[PDB]
Design a protein around this ligand. Structure first.
Ligand code: CL
Ligand code: CL
Ligand code: CL
Ligand code: CL
Ligand code: NI
Length: 91
């Protein structure tokens, strides 16, 4: 498809089932460690994906702490717009 993947997750008993990872001295948060059978896997989330939006707000330039806050503070559901960094670039 041509639209970025939009992963819509409902929180389970063990959370969403993925980790969020940031680099050194460079903006960007990425998906890691997607648990098998989790809401994250069922929604199509993949390790290595760059997180572009959370619940309709752009997080490409935000700190790790801000993005976690935006994912968490939400009410047991989150919509994550993600892209393959290999094939996608913000200009
Ligand atoms: Cl690390
Ligand atoms: Cl990973
Ligand atoms: Cl979103
Ligand atoms: Cl980029
Ligand atoms: Ni890139």
């Amino acid at each position: 498809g041509m639209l970025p993947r939009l992963c819509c997750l409902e929180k389970g008993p063990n959370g969403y089932g993925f980790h969020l990872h940031g680099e050194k001295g460079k903006l960007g948060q990425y998906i890691r460690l997607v648990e098998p059978g989790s809401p994250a896997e069922k929604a199509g989330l993949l390790a290595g994906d760059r997180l572009v939006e959370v619940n309709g707000e752009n997080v490409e330039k935000e700190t790790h702490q801000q993005v976690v806050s935006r994912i968490r503070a939400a009410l047991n559901a989150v919509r994550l717009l993600v892209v393959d960094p290999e094939e996608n670039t913000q200009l």
